[PDB]
Amino acid sequence: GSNPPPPETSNPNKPKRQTNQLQYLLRVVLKTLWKHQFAWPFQQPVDAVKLNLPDYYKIIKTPMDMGTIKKRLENNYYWNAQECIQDFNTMFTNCYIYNKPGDDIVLMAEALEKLFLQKINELP
Ligand SMILES: COc1ccc(Br)cc1S(=O)(=O)Nc1cc2c(C)noc2cc1O
Numbered sequence: 001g002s003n004p005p006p007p008e009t010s011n012p013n014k015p016k017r018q019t020n021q022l023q024y025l026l027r028v029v030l031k032t033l034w035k036h037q038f039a040w041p042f043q044q045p046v047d048a049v050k051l052n053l054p055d056y057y058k059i060i061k062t063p064m065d066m067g068t069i070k071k072r073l074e075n076n077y078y079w080n081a082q083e084c085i086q087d088f089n090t091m092f093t094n095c096y097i098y099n100k101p102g103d104d105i106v107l108m109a110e111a112l113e114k115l116f117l118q119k120i121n122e123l124p
């Protein structure tokens with residue numbers, strides 16, 4: 001079991017720009033999630049080798065994490081806030097797909113997702 005290559009964080013020919021919503025996504029939303037107690041499992045791509053999860057990438061084909069998101073935001077990878085939001089949704093959804101209701105990790109995802117949804121209500 002090897003790890004796949006992580007998701008891209010820059011792409012010359014993918015349309016990209018800066019928006020004040022995307023700035024907020026970085027400065028406020030991502031920063032709040034990043035510093036939360038429960039951030040740690042979601043700060044980097046799932047290392048299926050070191051975490052001993054050899055079925056992870058059998059089940060999850062569209063992986064996403066906050067390390068990847070942070071870098072995409074810092075590089076202005078996105079065209080709009082909706083693309084970034086979709087990456088967050090993918091992250092949480094993957095957690096819920098791979099794991100089971102009530103699992104420690106699922107409860108952490110849920111608390112981060114509540115907090116995410118609260119912060120994207122205040123999107124300018
Ligand atoms: C068994 O390892 C656990 C147990 C509970 C928690 Br909260 C976290 C881990 S882990 O971070 O060492 N491994 C692990 C990470 C993820 C991710 C990210 N999505 O689903 C996972 C399942 C895991 O066991």
Ligand code: NA
Nearest residue numbers: 096097098099
């Ligand atoms: Na599941």
